[PDB]
Amino acid sequence: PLAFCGSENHSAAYRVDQGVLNNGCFVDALNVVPHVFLLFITFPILFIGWGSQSSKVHIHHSTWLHFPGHNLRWILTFMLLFVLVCEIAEGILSDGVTESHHLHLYMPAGMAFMAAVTSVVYYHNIETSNFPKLLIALLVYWTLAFITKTIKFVKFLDHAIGFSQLRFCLTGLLVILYGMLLLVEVNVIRVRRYIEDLQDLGVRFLQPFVNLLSKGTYWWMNAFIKTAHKKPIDLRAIGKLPIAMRALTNYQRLCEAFDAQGARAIWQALSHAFGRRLVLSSTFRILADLLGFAGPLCIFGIVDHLGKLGVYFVSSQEFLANAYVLAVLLFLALLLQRTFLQASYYVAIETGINLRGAIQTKIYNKIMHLSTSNLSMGEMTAGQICNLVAIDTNQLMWFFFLCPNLWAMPVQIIVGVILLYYILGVSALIGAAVIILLAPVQYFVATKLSQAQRSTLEYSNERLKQTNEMLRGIKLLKLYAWENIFRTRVETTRRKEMTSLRAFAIYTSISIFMNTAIPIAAVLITFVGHVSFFKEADFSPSVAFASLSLFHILVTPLFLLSSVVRSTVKALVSVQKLSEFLSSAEIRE
Amino acid sequence: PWRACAKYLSSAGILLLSLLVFSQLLKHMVLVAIDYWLAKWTDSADQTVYAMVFTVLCSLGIVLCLVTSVTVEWTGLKVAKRLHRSLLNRIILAPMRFFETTPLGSILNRFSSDCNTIDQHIPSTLECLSRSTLLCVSALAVISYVTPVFLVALLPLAIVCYFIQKYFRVASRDLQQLDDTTQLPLLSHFAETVEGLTTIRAFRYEARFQQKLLEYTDSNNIASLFLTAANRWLEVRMEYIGACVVLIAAVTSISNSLHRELSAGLVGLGLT
Amino acid sequence: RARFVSKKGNCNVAHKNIREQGRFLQDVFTTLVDLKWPHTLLIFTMSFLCSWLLFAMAWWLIAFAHGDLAPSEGTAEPCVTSIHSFSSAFLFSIEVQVTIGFGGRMVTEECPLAILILIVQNIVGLMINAIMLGSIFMKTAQAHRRAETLIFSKHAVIALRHGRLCFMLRVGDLRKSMIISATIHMQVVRKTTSPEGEVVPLHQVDIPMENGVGGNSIFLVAPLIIYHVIDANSPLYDLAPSDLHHHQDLEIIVILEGVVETTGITTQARTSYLADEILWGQRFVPIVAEEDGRYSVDYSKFDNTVKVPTPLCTARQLDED
Amino acid sequence: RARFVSKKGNCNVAHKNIREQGRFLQDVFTTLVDLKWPHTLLIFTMSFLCSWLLFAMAWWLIAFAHGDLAPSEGTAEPCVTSIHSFSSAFLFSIEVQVTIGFGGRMVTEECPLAILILIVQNIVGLMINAIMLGSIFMKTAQAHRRAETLIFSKHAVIALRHGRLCFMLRVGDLRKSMIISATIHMQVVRKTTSPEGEVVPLHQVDIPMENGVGGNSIFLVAPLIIYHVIDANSPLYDLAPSDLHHHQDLEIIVILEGVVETTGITTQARTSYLADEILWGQRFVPIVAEEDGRYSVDYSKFDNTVKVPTPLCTARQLDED
């Protein structure tokens, strides 16, 4: 059948014998009326307003202003959805303990789920207005809903329902998040007082100025995708840059880093220029794959279970033990992990693009105060100057693309082996072959790779300056018949660069062989050391497949560790060549 | 596809391309064989027969990744040498009418940056490409082995991933090309401010060419930022599709091992 | 190159980058009746279903609060008789609010809060009965659908009448109903600049129709010839016949507007005319024939032309001989 | 110093010391629909509650008069079945008057005075159903809320066009709906005296808009420039640029009025312009751009000005060289 409590005793559970709030059926019956208040007032305001007034007409595509409490209310609304889908999964299978379909456990949370998504689209559309008088009833929603949850919550204390009940910990968290949603709405009352950048036509990038869910998922990048099949995109339809991330603004930040004050001077001034956006990128890179370690705990939790008031209210440890709730926890954790990894990748490439703008302006201001005795007599060639912008900034930019992975590999591998110690014990310390093997042999191939890269970069600069005097001097070489002699001179210096590449290729090959060869030896040494020599402990399938996904998630940045030790040595010699160019001989005024 | 990668394979050679595809096919087959023997060995209810064949199949794994590693360094070395010294021999016998009509910076640009990405950037990218796509299709093979109604979950999902691939692709055939539309001025502008430095300091137009380089760097950084934001939009879309693949495979392996028999390790194969 | 308003009569504007959307919320009624027909039908049944669901939860909550949903009862009367589900209260809110009122579900005299929610039920249900039925009658009662039954010419012409160049077209009505106080506004619209250098981009200047008095008021039963004398005060005074070509910024809008006789609600039809839509030198066919006691208009010969030799020069060059 | 009508468009008058309030009682309907929204809602539910309470006392009095409230009874039928309280008769008057009609309370055929009060119940209840639902539809259906979606300029300007000083402003519509027969009335209003000594305190004199014909009728889709040529017959003829300052008795009212297309009910928006609101010498920005097949109006550049050098003298001093 159906109703909004069950027909279990069939004459009980709708009864009012005391005052009416003593029924738990009555307090989750009262827990739907703020949500249907918010749905049933906010549906005709959203239908005649933002959307379906035929909003093909444009109501300021650019200059999206953000309120006080924006970047807080979206994280709190996603925390409401993280507690509320868990409240849905708690109401189900406490429904499924007995029969005949209790709807009072999870239909209030589903009405709160629809109220949560309509309140966040109402807050985004009031943030398009700057008309916060048309906010105001949403604030009334929070001083409905919170109060009703506290009239739930003291009736958890009145029937002495403890902390080991899961819905106690759910609804106390819901009481305090409704409380801080009230605190941020009186913070909008504090500073806006109901009782923008001058974003012009030239800004068309919007990702500093869009909302946080479109900062994560790039909903602004559906436009310039759907219109790309209409029109081929050109240089005026992408617009101009904003004022932050201007090349002169990053140039002014680099001169402010310079006068605050060698190779250590340009490195420490570079970290003083860009380190706060760098630690934002690596902080997102810390929280990404710390979310991903809840992957293998879910793997152990589902195949551990698959290897195997009157109780039905409480669930907590069996709520963590069941399989479908861990699968939707895997879905929400993997959604949130790929969102933080793509956000970290965006702000790392954005900091590197601003650095390419800043040192291209600083390398041109070195060029405008350069004496021409360095070009003419001896030292600098014009091929080396256009390689110093065209190659030797791009190697540094690729190092700043790969920098927060270098800052987030130790917090991945240490929390991975401590979670290996939780899932396997000291038999997982037979697989400490990564920490007794990896970093001295990667430093040994970092020394051999860097000596090969220094010899390869000087041979490449000699081959490019020899091809630059070759190709400008074609007509004298074809008019005096020395082209085979000059081709053999390029061929011998090409053979020197080819032998430097041959040493580079055998050292790169032995590092990528050790890089993919040690984790399959780690699953060898953990699976044979669990069974043999530490004999008759256990061998479940559960910690076996949990440690297999743990060793695969250890090996997944290990294949990028060979890419990052392919990097940084061009950055070190590029900063060395840039400090040698930036301390060249200049013009006295 | 394009013809020129087969040109790459005729500068590789038939023994290199066949040794490459043989080494990748047996290395990915021996890692899915060590996963299937982890399925056979974790379902206990004869011991060390499984551990003996586990150790020698892992010995096939480390020698197959060794011959993977040396075949990708030797195909990088042979296309490094072979795509030099033939372009060098075609440019040493050329007419003067070819040099007087073509721009010289184009020919030195293919001698410099294109030869740099052939001898440097391409063989690890080849390794990561072929390793990742054979890991993806062997993962699709072991997931489609266990839960065959995931074959029904083959039918929209990769296809609509193919559809959003087409909904990317011509925009990238705009926009990456638009990056080269603001790449080719700016370094040439650096060429114009190295052959003419005494003239520009004689004319005192240094702030004007400074402002022109600020405009060129503004256009180049907004084209790299829009190519960046298209790339991370495309990756957050398709990794949301991949987490949806994880969800539908997870709920059909839990629903097909609760009520059917999958022996509690094949679900670990599909989930890993 | 493009049209200001199409040959149907819909405009071609965009209205980009508006800011004050708070005054869009300061009229809800024109924004309610301004919508399309699935939007009007969806806001109709969503308004009534939101009313019936909200009071269904109110009647189910007050039946839970009296304990009448608990069947362990004695001889005490309920608030509402025979409610034992949510769907019984949904049936009861449908019976009360649109006043069907069956009576197996009826409300007794036990608690007064049921009487207070019954009072506020028929107040807001009677109120949104008035708002929604007057809104759907105002949606069907607009008169621009009458503007779909008013034909203009497909081609306007320029010919000679009374020694002068005149701009002529033909307006016809399909109905035997009338148009009360039929007003004609003919605007030329092009990018004109000032002599002082103010360039205004889409300039509308009113030309007058020729009437006999000069008041813009006609009497439309037959298809007539609206004609404008191109004199020196007209802004068509230096129009050449070589200017009548595609990609030429010169547009005519004719606007026929007035009350339609059988609703009392005013309408406005509009038609543009482009430079490749204006035919030089031609004139319209006589289309009204009198036979067997009846005047009669052929409508198949509406936009046909019976082309006459004209001077191929401007009206400023009509001032000599 | 103070405004005649504010920049919203509400007037600033008082109407003190009226005597004939008997003619205020000679229209009850415009005074009914003239009220504010809590006054209209309070007279709505107080009209229906006064009807239900008055007939509740009538049905309870006739149930007392038949003795049916006395439960010491035999097999004689009541007038109305199952009434045994005042609240049962209040339920019965609610069931009859808005015609819910449940039927546990039903009226039998015993006495005819119940039939006479049932006849007069549905006559005055059906009558005030018609008056109150047509009144609340006439309350929501007024068109001055459409006057909240019509923007004028924040600053009117005075510039040069065709050799003459002209008073210009910009009117825009936010909607894709239309205004049927858009009439412009521009009145200057100031304290003028007569030459004979009659000082009249707030004088309104009509200036004409420049149209091309002279009829005050525009066609509003784009924001246009309403401009008035300051000639010798205008009363702005001796206006200096030094007069444009605060505390100067010179006010402009522009009045845009006409039928809105989707209701058929006429509206009127109005905007004043003060002497420190009129900018001398400036002109308006071109705001309409044509791109990808669409004309498009920027609304952020609405009241911006692109100031031009002008003669700093009156239009009477424009008559020399």
d(CA C83, CA C88): 5
**Contacting residues for B228 by C-beta, under 8 A, at least 6 apart:** A346, A349, A350, A353
CB C86 within 8 A of CB C69: no
Phi, psi at residue D207, to the nearest 5°?
A: -100, 150
For chain A, the C-alpha Rg in angstroms (whole number) is: 32
**Contacting residues for B122 by C-beta, under 8 A, at least 6 apart:** B76, B79
Q: Give the number of C-D residue pairs with CB atoms closer than 8 Å.
A: 210
Q: Does one domain contain both C189 and C160?
A: yes
Q: Which domain holds residue D182?
A: 1-13+143-321
Q: Does one domain contain both D137 and D256?
A: no
Strands D251-260, D179-193: pairing kind = antiparallel
Phi, psi at residue A107, to the nearest 5°?
A: -65, -30
CB A217 within 8 A of CB B239: no
Phi-psi region of A95 (alpha: psi -120 to 50; beta: other; left: phi over 0): alpha
The DSSP secondary-structure symbol of C203 reads E
Encoded amino acid at B92, one letter:
I
Q: Which of D56, D60, D106 is nearest to D68 (CA)?
A: D60
Location of structure tokens 């430079």: C275
**Contacting residues for A350 by C-beta, under 8 A, at least 6 apart:** A245, A277, B225, B228
Q: Which of D168, D207, D169 is nearest to D189 (CA)?
A: D207
SS3 track for A32-57:
CHHHHHHHHHHHHHHHHCCCCCCCCC
Q: Does one domain contain both D213 and D90?
A: no
Q: Which of A497, A505, A500, A502 is nearest to A466 (CA)?
A: A497
Q: Does one domain contain both C4 and C44?
A: no
Q: How far, in Å, are A307, B60, B62, D191 from residue B35 at the CA level?
A: 19, 14, 15, 98
How many CB atoms sit inside 10 A of residue A321's CB?
15
- Which of C26, C51, C69, C113 to mutate to probe the A interface, most A CBs <10 Å? C69
CA distance A189 to chain B (A): 36
Which residue is closest to D148 within chain C, CA to CA?
C23
Last residue of a domain, one of C113, C142, C171: C142
d(CA C178, CA C175): 8
Q: Is A198 helix (H, G, I), strand (E, B) or coil?
A: coil
Q: Exposure pattern of A142-158 as b/e (b: 16+ CB <10 Å)?
A: bebbbebbbebbebbee
Q: Does one domain contain both C190 and C115?
A: no
Cβ contacts of C13 on chain D, cutoff 8 Å: 176, 221-222, 294-297
- Structural biology method used: cryo-EM
d(CA C228, CA C249): 20
CB A178 within 8 A of CB A145: yes
* A60's tokens: 């300021």
Last residue of a domain, one of D77, D108, D142: D142
* C210's tokens: 């020729």
The DSSP secondary-structure symbol of C161 reads E
Chain B from 188 to 247: CB within 8 A of any A CB: 190-191, 193-195, 197-198, 201, 206, 210, 213-214, 217-219, 221-226, 228-230, 232-233, 235-236, 239-240, 242-244, 246-247
Query: Concatenated DSSP letters for chain B?
Result: --SHHHHHHHHH-HHHHHHHHHHHHHHHHHHHHHHHHHHHHH----TTHHHHHHHHHHHHHHHHHHHHHHHHHHHHHHHHHHTSSSHHHHHSS--HHHHHHS-HHHHHHHHHHHHHIIIIIHHHHHHHHHHHHHHHHHHHHHHHHH-GGGTTTTTTHHHHHHHHHHHHHHHHHHHHHHHHHTTTTHHHHHHHTTSSHHHHHHHT-HHHHHHHHHHHHHHHHHHHHHHHHHHHHHHHHHHHHHHHHHHHHHHHHHHHHHSS--TTTHHHHHH-
Chain D from 27 to 66: CB within 8 A of any C CB: 44-45, 48-49
Query: Concatenated DSSP letters for A316-377?
Result: HHHHHH-HHHHHHHHHHHHHHHHHHHHHHHHHHHHHHHHHHHHHHHHHHHHHTTB-THHHHS
Q: How far, in Å, are A295, C34, D177 from residue A54 at the CA level?
A: 44, 9, 12
How many alpha carbons fall within 13 Å on the CB side of residue D97? 31
Q: Does one domain contain both C303 and C165?
A: yes
Strands C199-207, D199-207: pairing kind = unpaired
Q: Is A394 helix (H, G, I), strand (E, B) or coil?
A: helix
The answer, for D10 touching chain C at a CB cutoff of 8 Å, is no
d(CA B81, CA B74): 11
Q: Does one domain contain both D314 and D208?
A: yes
CB C191 within 8 A of CB C202: yes
- By residue count, chain C amounts to 321
* A197's tokens: 């950048």
CB B247 within 8 A of CB A331: yes
* A243's tokens: 């004022």
**Contacting residues for B226 by C-beta, under 8 A, at least 6 apart:** A205, A224, A238, B175
* A281's tokens: 């990128």
Q: Which of C198, C203, C200, C194 is nearest to D282 (CA)?
A: C198
Q: Which of A541, A321, A330, A552 is nearest to B250 (CA)?
A: A330
Q: Is A28 helix (H, G, I), strand (E, B) or coil?
A: helix
Location of structure tokens 């420039």: D225
Last residue of a domain, one of D89, D118, D142: D142
Location of structure tokens 């990528």: A512
**Contacting residues for C184 by C-beta, under 8 A, at least 6 apart:** C209, C216, C217, C218, C226, C254, C255, C256
* A37's tokens: 């208040």
Q: How far, in Å, are D17, D33, D34, D35 from residue D28 at the CA level?
A: 21, 9, 10, 11
CB A343 within 8 A of CB B236: no
Q: Exposure pattern of A520-551 as b/e (b: 16+ CB <10 Å)?
A: bbbbbbbbbbbbeeeeeeeeebbbbbbbbbbb
How many CB atoms sit inside 10 A of residue C5's CB?
20
SS3 track for chain D:
CCCCECCCCCECCCCCCCCCCCCCCCCCHHHHHCCCHHHHHHHHHHHHHHHHHHHHHHHHHHHHHCCCCCCCCCCCCCCECCCCCHHHHHHHHHHHHCCCCCCCCCECCCCCHHHHHHHHHHHHHHHHHHHHHHHHHHHHCCHHHHHHHEECCCCEEEEEECCEEEEEEEEEECCCCCEEEEEEEEEEEEEEECCCCCEEEEEEEEECCCCCCCCCCECCCCCEEEEEECCCCCCCCCCCHHHCCCCCCCEEEEEEEEEECCCCCEEEEEEEECCCCEEECCCECCCEEEECCEEEECCCCCCCECCCCCCCCCCCCCCCC
The separation between CA D289 and the C-alpha centre of its own chain, rounded to angstroms, equals: 34
Longest dimension (CA), chain B: 90
* Touching pair D, B by Cβ (3+ pairs < 8 Å): no
d(CA B220, CA A360): 11
Angle at A351 between CA A348 and CA A352, to 5 degrees: 85
- The dihedral over CA atoms of D291, D292, D295, D296, expressed in degrees to the nearest 10, equals -70
Q: Which of A482, A470, A451 is nearest to A383 (CA)?
A: A470
Q: Does one domain contain both C297 and C224?
A: yes
Q: Which residues pair with B1 in a beta bridge?
A: none
Cβ contacts of A48 on chain C, cutoff 8 Å: 25, 28, 31-32
* Strands (E) located in chain C: 150-151, 156-161, 164-173, 179-193, 199-207, 224-229, 251-260, 266-273, 278-280, 288-291, 294-297
Encoded amino acid at D257, one letter:
E
* A357's tokens: 């703008």
How many CB atoms sit inside 10 A of residue B183's CB?
16
CB C155 within 8 A of CB C277: yes
First-last CA distance in chain B = 32
Structural element, H or E, at residue A242: none
Query: Concatenated DSSP letters for A539-571?
Result: --SHHHHHHHHHHHHHHTTHHHHHHHHHSSHHH
What's the structural domain count of chain D? 2
Angle at B9 between CA B3 and CA B11, to 5 degrees: 110
CB B54 within 8 A of CB B41: yes
Going C45 to C50 to C53 to C59, the CA torsion angle's sign is: negative
Name the burial class of residue A497, with classes exposed (0-12), middle (13-18) and buried (19+) by CB atoms within 10 angstroms of its CB: buried
Cβ contacts of C208 on chain D, cutoff 8 Å: 212-213
CB A148 within 8 A of CB A31: yes
Q: Which of C2, A548, D40, A190 is nearest to B32 (CA)?
A: A548
d(CA A388, CA A374): 15
Structural element, H or E, at residue C76: none
How many CB atoms sit inside 10 A of residue C264's CB?
11
Q: Which of C256, C248, C239, C235 is nearest to C188 (CA)?
A: C235
Strands C278-280, C156-161: pairing kind = parallel
CA distance D176 to chain A (A): 9
Chain B from 42 to 61: CB within 8 A of any A CB: 42-44, 47-48, 51, 54-55, 58, 61
The answer, for D131 touching chain C at a CB cutoff of 8 Å, is no
CB B140 within 8 A of CB B246: no
Q: Does one domain contain both C151 and C120?
A: no
Location of structure tokens 């005709």: A44
The DSSP secondary-structure symbol of A209 reads T
First-last CA distance in chain A = 94
For chain D, the C-alpha Rg in angstroms (whole number) is: 31
d(CA D253, CA D187): 5
d(CA C28, CA C21): 12
CA distance D294 to chain A (A): 12
The DSSP secondary-structure symbol of C210 reads P
Q: Which residues pair with C169 in a beta bridge?
A: C226
d(CA A190, CA A181): 14
CB C227 within 8 A of CB C208: no
Phi, psi at residue D132, to the nearest 5°?
A: -80, -35
Q: Does one domain contain both D90 and D147?
A: no
* Touching pair A, C by Cβ (3+ pairs < 8 Å): yes
d(CA D169, CA D157): 6
Going B142 to B143 to B147 to B151, the CA torsion angle's sign is: negative
Q: Which residues pair with C185 in a beta bridge?
A: C255
Location of structure tokens 């208009």: C297
Q: Which of D258, D278, D174 is nearest to D216 (CA)?
A: D258
Q: Does one domain contain both D279 and D226?
A: yes
CB A478 within 8 A of CB A521: no
Going D270 to D271 to D274 to D280, the CA torsion angle's sign is: negative
* A464's tokens: 């490019």
**Contacting residues for B219 by C-beta, under 8 A, at least 6 apart:** A235, B182
Q: Does one domain contain both C131 and C180?
A: no
Q: Which of A287, A292, A515, A281 is nearest to A403 (CA)?
A: A281
d(CA B34, CA A522): 13
Cβ contacts of B29 on chain A, cutoff 8 Å: none
CB contact under 8 A, A299 and B268: yes
Going B149 to B151 to B155 to B156, the CA torsion angle's sign is: positive
CB A95 within 8 A of CB A101: yes
Going B38 to B42 to B45 to B46, the CA torsion angle's sign is: positive
- The dihedral over CA atoms of A457, A459, A462, A468, expressed in degrees to the nearest 10, equals -80
Q: Which of A430, A413, A405, A406 is nearest to A550 (CA)?
A: A413
The separation between CA C46 and the C-alpha centre of its own chain, rounded to angstroms, equals: 25
Q: Interface partners of D (3+ CB pairs, < 8 Å)?
A: A, C
CB C177 within 8 A of CB C267: no
Q: Which residues pair with C251 in a beta bridge?
A: C189
Angle at A13 between CA A10 and CA A17, to 5 degrees: 120
d(CA A559, CA A555): 7
Q: Is A296 helix (H, G, I), strand (E, B) or coil?
A: helix
* B238's tokens: 């398709």
